[PDB]
RNA sequence: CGGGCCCCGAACGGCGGCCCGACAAUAAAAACAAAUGGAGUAAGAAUGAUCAGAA
C-alpha cells in the first residue's frame, strides 16, 4: 500500500475545531500533507496536532496568517527540506519536502490569486519561478510526488459552467496554459485523471450553502507526480466531507510501497 | 510510396513552422514546433530539443489551419 | 482495407475513430494512405494507422 | 497462414456471433462480415472497422469446429 | 530464425500443459494450447478463443516442462 | 545486432537479470536460450516471452 | 532508414557521450549515455548496460544542448 | 588564520539558523548546525551525518544572520 | 580533534552499520573497523580501505549522542 | 606566505567591485566581497553567502582594478 | 606522519600478493597487486608499473579479506 | 620553490601567452602577470586570480626554455 | 531595442581603407562589434590611436610579418575575455584567428589564406582548411554558442558567384573547396546568416581589380557569417552595400535580435 | 573480453586490418539529498427546404 492525503485546512485551528485531527487519526494513511497552517512552527509543536504514530514536520511563513504548511509521516523521512530559493517561496514557507528512499514527496501551496490583482501577479511570478525550478528538476533521478493545491483547473472536465469562470481567476488562459505545459511537455502526469477519467469531481467549492447545494466546485488539488510513479496508481477518491475543509480531502493510493 | 500523404503534410508543417501539439499513445500532450522529420522520427524544438518516435505518436493537432 | 476507407472518404460519411488509447475522435475523412489518415475537423488532425483501433461510421455504406 | 484464415472463414460462413476484445480490453460484439490480412469488419448495429493490430483475442459465443 | 519458439510451443501443446498467457494488459488466460501458427495461437478454453501473437506477451506454464 | 551479443553474454555468465516488460512488471531470472522471436528465461517456471513486447533487459550485477 | 535522420542524431549523441533521458512508453525514465545502437536496440551505460528496445522508446530528451 | 570562520559558525550554531550546505559535487543539504571544528562539521537535521570541511563549498543560511 | 575523535570512537564502539558516501557520489556500506588521521577501514563482506580525503560525509543508520 | 593574495583581495573588498567567483565544478557565484580570511570569503549579496577558499577556482572581477 | 594502520595494511596486501582493486576519486577501477607504497605514492603492479598517487585514490578494495595485526 | 618558481618567472619575463588548465578540464588563455605560493595572476582584459590547487597544468603557447 | 549589429570588413590593408574613410564611416556607423579582417599591420601599428575608435575596445593579433596577414576586432563594451590562438602553424604563426568571449556567444574574426596568389598559397589554404575543419569537429562539442566573422575566399554555391562556369578554374569555386565549404555548412551543422535571410542572387562580396567585373558584378561571395545552428533563427536582416566599397571586398553588415552582455 | 571505425561478399549478410574501452582538455550550467491483479471500464453538433443503396 501507499496512501497520500491532501487537506488544505486553511487554518489548522479551524480544522481542529472541525474534527480534522480525529478524522486523520482514524484515517489510516502513510503521509498527510495539510496546507495553510496559518500558524507558527511553535504552534504546530502543540502535541494536540501530533497524530499518534506519525511524525511532526512544519514550516511557517514569515507572517503566521499568511500561510504555512505542515507534513506528517508514518515513518521517519530520510531528510526534510524547505524553500526553493524564490522570495515568494522562502519568505512564506509555501514549500516543504521530505525525503524517502527512491521517492521523495513534497507539499506545495500556491497563492490563491483570487483576493486581489497583486495576488494574481504573485501567482504568475511563482508559476514562472516554479516551472523554471522544475526544468532544473528534470534529469533528477529521485522521483517526486508534488502533492499541492495549485488553485488552477486543467480542463473543463475539472470544473462546470466554465463559460462563467473563464474570466474569473483560477481558470484564466495563462494559468491553464502553464499547467498544461508543466504536465504534458515535461512528461508529468496525474494519478486521478489517469486512474479515473470521471467528471464532476471537485475539491474546493464556496462555503456558501447555495454553492454546496448546487455543487459549484473548482478542482484545485492535484497529485503532481513524476512519470516514474505514473504506473503505480491504484485509485483516487474525493470524499464529500461535510464542510470539514474548503479543499475536500484528496486521498490516493499507490501500488509502490515506501522504505526508509 | 509509404508517406505519399504523410511526407507532404509534415514538410508543409515544417516549412510553415506551425506550433503543433503531439498527443502520444500514452496520452501525454506534447506542444512545440516541428523542427525536422524522416521515416520514423520527428524533431520537436522547444525548451528542450525533443525527439519523438513516430511509432508512439497518436495524433498531432496544429494550432492553426494549414 | 483500401476500398472501405476510400468509400468512407468519398461519400463524406461522418466518422468517429476510437484510438488505441481509447480517445473518441470525431471528424471527416480528408485523405488516407498506408500509414496516415488525415481527419478534417476544424483542423487537419492527422491520425496514424498503427494507433487506430475502430472506425465507427455514423451510417452503414 | 494455415490457421487464422480457415478459422476466420469458418466463423464468417457460419455467421457465429463472436465477441472481440481490444488490446486495451474494451469488449466488442458483432458478426464477422469479411476478413482481411490487416483488418476486419464487425457488423453490430453499425458496421465498425476494427484493426487487427488492436485485437487481443477473438471469443466465439458458440463452440466452433475446424475443418 | 524462428527455430526456438516452434519446438517450445509444439512441446507445450503435445503434453497439453496448462499455460497462463499474461496479456500486455495484465489479464490472465489459463488454458491449454490446442494449436499455433503465424500471428495466432489456439487456446483450449471452454470456448477455444483464438488469440493473436502481437497482443500476447508472456507464456508461463504452471508446471515446468522439459525442452 | 548488439542484442545477440548482450543476450548470449548474459547466458554464458548466467547473470541474474531483471527484465521490464512493456507494461512495466519487473521480471527476474537468468536467460537460458534466445532467438530473434522469443526468449526462454531460466526462471523457476521459465516463462517464455516474445520479442515484440520487450522494454529493457538489465543485469542486477555489473 | 531511407532518409535516416535518426542516424546523425544518435551518432552525435554517442560521439559526444551526452547525458540522455530516454523516456519509455510505460512511463519510466532511463538516465545514462548512449554507448551504441543498431536497428532495434540502444545501449545505455549507467554503471551497467541497459538493452532498451527501440519500439518502447517514447521520447529522447538530451539534458545537454547538442548543436547540429 | 581561521579567525573569521570560527565566530561565523559559532553564531550560526548558537542562533540555530537553518543552513543549507552545498557540497563540491553539487549536492545540497539542509538543517541547522550542530557543531563544528577543524576539517569536520556536524549538521543538525533529521539525521546527524558528519560532513568534512574539505568537501564543503558554500554555507548559505536560510535567513541572513549577522556576524 | 575535539569532536572528530570521540564521534569516530563511538561509531566504532557501537558497530553501527553506517553507509559512507564518497565525494565522487559512490555509495558504500559496512561497519566501522578502525580509523586514523588519514585513513578509515570499512568492513563489508571484505574489508575495504577508504581515505579521509575522498569521503563526502558519514551517515549513521541510528541516531547517536556524543559523550 | 600569501604575499600577493591579501593585497588583491582587500583591494577588491575596498572598491566593492561585483566579482564573479567560479567554483571547481563550473557553477558561477556573484556578489560583492564582504569579508575574507585564510579559508573563507563572504559575499554581500542578499543571501549573505559564505564560500570556502579550497573550493574556489578563480576570482574574476567585473572591471579592471589597480594594483596597490 | 606516524600513523598505525596504513603501513601494516599495505605491507600485508603486498606480501600476501592479494589481487587489489583500487578506486580512484574519478570513479575508475584500477586492478593489480601492490608493489610498494610511500607517503604520497602507491605502485600498482599489473603487467605495467603504474605509479598511482595517494591523493588520487578513493578506496582500496582487496579481492579477499586479510587478517589484521 | 625548486622548479615551478623559475619556470613561472621565465614565463613572466617574456610575457609569453600561456594556457592554464583547471582541474575541471577548462582552459584559460592569457599571460602571467605575477604569482606566489598559492595564487597566479593571469592578466587578460581583467585581472583574474586563479588558485594553485585548482590548476592542473601550465602550457606555454610557444616553445620556451628555462 | 535588443538589436546586435556585427560589421565584418575585409580591408586588405587597413591603411587603404582608412585613407578611403573606413575608420570615420565605422565610427559614425553604429555597431556593437566590428569584425575587420586582413589588417596587414602589426599590433603596434594598430596601437596607433588614429585607428583606435572612441567608445570601443581594440583587440588584434598580428602575424609574424604584418603585411602577410593580421586580424583585428573592435568592441563597444569590454568583452568577457579575448583569445588569440588556434593551435596551427598556419594559424598561430600568421595571426589569422582572433576570438572574443561574451554571454553565451563568441564573436570570432577569421581570415583564411586567399590562395589566389600562388600554388604554394593554395597548398597553405588546403592545409588550413583541413586543420580548421578538424578544429570545428572538436569545437562542436562545446555547448556555448559561437559566431565566426570569416572571409573564407570560397564560393559556396552557384548563386554565390557569377559565371561559375568560368570561375570553376579560379580558386574559390574549385571542387575540393566546394566540398569543404558545404561539409562545414552541411554535416557540421553550421549555417550562414545571408543565405538564411535572403536566398537572392547577385549578392557578392569580392570582385577583381578591373572595374569591368565590378560593373558587370562578376564577383564572389567570399565573405560569410558562419553561425552556429543556435542563432540561425535569430538572424534579422543582412545587406551587402556594393557602392560604398573600400577594397576588393565589400562591407558585410548583419544585425541580430540577440542581446549580448 | 566488446564497443566504435575502415576492409569484403550477394535493402540483405558478415570477415580481416586496426584504435580505444580514463575525451591533448566545455571561458566555466546560484548548486543530480547522495548512481504479472488477472478472463477484459468505450451519456446528448440551437435543427441537409427534404438521402430508396443490389452476388
Amino acid at each position: 500500500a501507499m496512501r497520500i492525503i491532501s487537506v488544505n485546512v486553511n487554518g489548522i485551528q479551524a480544522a481542529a475545531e472541525r474534527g480534522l485531527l480525529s478524522w486523520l487519526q482514524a484515517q489510516n494513511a502513510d503521509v498527510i500533507c495539510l496546507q495553510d497552517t496559518r500558524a507558527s512552527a511553535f504552534d504546530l509543536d502543540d502535541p494536540s496536532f501530533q497524530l499518534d504514530g506519525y511524525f511532526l514536520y512544519a514550516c511557517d511563513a514569515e507572517l503566521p496568517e499568511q500561510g504555512g504548511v505542515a507534513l506528517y509521516s508514518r515513518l521517519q523521512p530520510k531528510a526534510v527540506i524547505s524553500g526553493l530559493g524564490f522570495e515568494t517561496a522562502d519568505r512564506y514557507g509555501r514549500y516543504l519536502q521530505a525525503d524517502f528512499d527512491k521517492v521523495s514527496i513534497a507539499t506545495l501551496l500556491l497563492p490563491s490569486g483570487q483576493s486581489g490583482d497583486e495576488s494574481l501577479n504573485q501567482k504568475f511570478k511563482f508559476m514562472d519561478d516554479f516551472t523554471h525550478y522544475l526544468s532544473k528538476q528534470r534529469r533528477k533521478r529521485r522521483e517526486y510526488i508534488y502533492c499541492g493545491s495549485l488553485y488552477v483547473a486543467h480542463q473543463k472536465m475539472d470544473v462546470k459552467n466554465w463559460r462563467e469562470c473563464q474570466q474569473m481567476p483560477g481558470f484564466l488562459a495563462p494559468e491553464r496554459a502553464w499547467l498544461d505545459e508543466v504536465f504534458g511537455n515535461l512528461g508529468y502526469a496525474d494519478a486521478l485523471r489517469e486512474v479515473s477519467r470521471e467528471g464532476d469531481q471537485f475539491s474546493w467549492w464556496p462555503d456558501s450553502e447555495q454553492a454546496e447545494m448546487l455543487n459549484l466546485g473548482w478542482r484545485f488539488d492535484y497529485q503532481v507526480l513524476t512519470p516514474g510513479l505514473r504506473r503505480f496508481v491504484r485509485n483516487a477518491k474525493l470524499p464529500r466531507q461535510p464542510r470539514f475543509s474548503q479543499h475536500a480531502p484528496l486521498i490516493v493510493d499507490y501500488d509502490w510501497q515506501l522504505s526508509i | 510510396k509509404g508517406h505519399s500523404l504523410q511526407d507532404p503534410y509534415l514538410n508543409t508543417l515544417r516549412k510553415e513552422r506551425v506550433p503543433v501539439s503531439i498527443y502520444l499513445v500514452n496520452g501525454i500532450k506534447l506542444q512545440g514546433q516541428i523542427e525536422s522529420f524522416d521515416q520514423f522520427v520527428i524533431l520537436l524544438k522547444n525548451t528542450v530539443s525533443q525527439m519523438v518516435y513516430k511509432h508512439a505518436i497518436s495524433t498531432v493537432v496544429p494550432s492553426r489551419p494549414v
Side-chain angles (χ1 to χ4, degrees), chain A residues 112-126:
Chain A
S112 64
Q114 298 157 31
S115 61
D117 61 326
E118 77 294 357
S119 69
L120 176 57
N121 301 114
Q122 293 289 0
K123 191 181 190 180
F124 283 128
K125 179 58 62 57
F126 189 83

Side-chain angles (χ1 to χ4, degrees), chain B:
Chain B
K1 292 179 174 178
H3 290 348
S4 175
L5 186 66
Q6 175 74 238
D7 197 333
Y9 182 72
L10 275 173
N11 200 318
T12 309
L13 284 179
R14 180 263 298 276
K15 296 298 295 184
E16 196 165 304
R17 299 177 183 176
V18 175
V20 300
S21 53
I22 305 194
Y23 290 87
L24 291 175
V25 168
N26 186 36
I28 305 297
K29 184 177 179 294
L30 293 179
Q31 211 173 321
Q33 308 168 21
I34 294 165
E35 181 61 17
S36 304
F37 70 98
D38 63 356
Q39 286 282 24
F40 298 98
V41 174
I42 311 179
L43 279 75
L44 274 71
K45 179 177 283 187
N46 205 246
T47 58
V48 298
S49 181
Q50 194 162 29
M51 189 202 78
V52 184
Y53 271 121
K54 268 189 170 183
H55 64 70
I57 286 172
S58 184
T59 78
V60 300
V61 193
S63 301
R64 299 182 177 180
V66 62

Side-chain angles (χ1 to χ4, degrees), chain A residues 43-112:
Chain A
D43 302 325
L44 273 292
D45 190 66
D46 173 16
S48 62
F49 305 112
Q50 296 177 224
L51 310 177
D52 298 330
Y54 295 90
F55 292 80
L56 167 58
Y57 298 112
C59 176
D60 54 356
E62 190 67 13
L63 192 146
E65 314 306 330
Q66 183 53 90
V69 184
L71 174 60
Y72 296 164
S73 296
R74 194 163 65 188
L75 74 165
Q76 193 173 44
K78 177 161 286 194
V80 67
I81 64 177
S82 53
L84 290 170
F86 317 139
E87 178 274 347
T88 60
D90 306 1
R91 190 56 163 246
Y92 313 110
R94 287 162 185 164
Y95 186 89
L96 179 138
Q97 157 174 321
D99 291 331
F100 298 90
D101 189 6
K102 300 144 90 181
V103 167
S104 300
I105 67 180
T107 71
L108 179 59
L109 170 69
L110 307 190
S112 64

